[PDB]
Amino acid sequence: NLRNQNKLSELLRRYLLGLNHNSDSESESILKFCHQLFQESEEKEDFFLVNLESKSYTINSNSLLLNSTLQKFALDLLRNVITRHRSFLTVSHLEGFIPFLRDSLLSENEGVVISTLRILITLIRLDFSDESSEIFKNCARKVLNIIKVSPSTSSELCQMGLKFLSAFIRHTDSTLKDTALSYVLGRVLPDLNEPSRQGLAFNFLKALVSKHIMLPELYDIADTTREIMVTNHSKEIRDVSRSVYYQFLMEYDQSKGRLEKQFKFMVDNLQYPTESGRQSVMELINLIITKANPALLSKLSSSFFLALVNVSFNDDAPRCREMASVLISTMLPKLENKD
């Protein structure tokens, strides 16, 4: 039953951790063991005879379940070994496992697939031969075939799908068609209302802004993440959301009218009710003050001052008052003589 499988998934998970502290993980024999595990995974007579059983056997086939579980064990074991021990992370050692990875990526179970996505990101840097390089290109197509069917991006398989997609654009020279990127931002943006499960999706957004890819949907994404920076309770989301928005604002082209609105938003969020919400805002204030053009500061100088003193002057949270003074403290020396 399903309850028992989850117990086994726990017990197997403990074994893999034990292998991490086991010495044989340091040897190359472990690689062959996983390779073995991969390829182990893949009438008149009755008229006379007295029959005394009224019960019938019920049809069931767990043989598929056995293969997937063992295959799941293989991928989890393999990824642990190569990451902990760098020397094994070599094309010559891992060439044999490529024909298994293509097979697993098509598997119906997603737990096995997610592990297949985990390993492939580790090997994305690693150079490979002509036949063994196609898998990275195919997996890029396959993850789309997941975001194809999947209703909501806030799924374990979809979330990891964006993770591999991010590393795909960051590292592999090949890049996907702009239209495919345009759609994916389409699917991410609705589910972004609930950021607690979109952490990986954020990192993928970070990957695009690093490469400076131009898409219409990024501008809307920038609008949404800015709200998440100040509204969401979770610290971790507020961090990544602040970074991607901060990188977005400086790099891409924006109309001068838009620029004033973005900084206009930033200051009024300084008057956001919750202490955490405004606290993240000073983090963006601090990033503008520490790293910005003298002109941009000068255009914005007198304004940032009067907003900071307000929070310092009257605010319920003592910490925010102190920080606003600190922001003023580091902001005043950098001002021009006129400002």
């Binding site: 789309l144 975001i147 194809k148 068609k177 239209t179 495919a180 345009s182 759609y183 994916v184 389409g186």
Partner: peptide
Amino acid sequence: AKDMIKH
């Protein structure tokens, strides 16, 4: 949108 990602 279902089609574009196919491409």
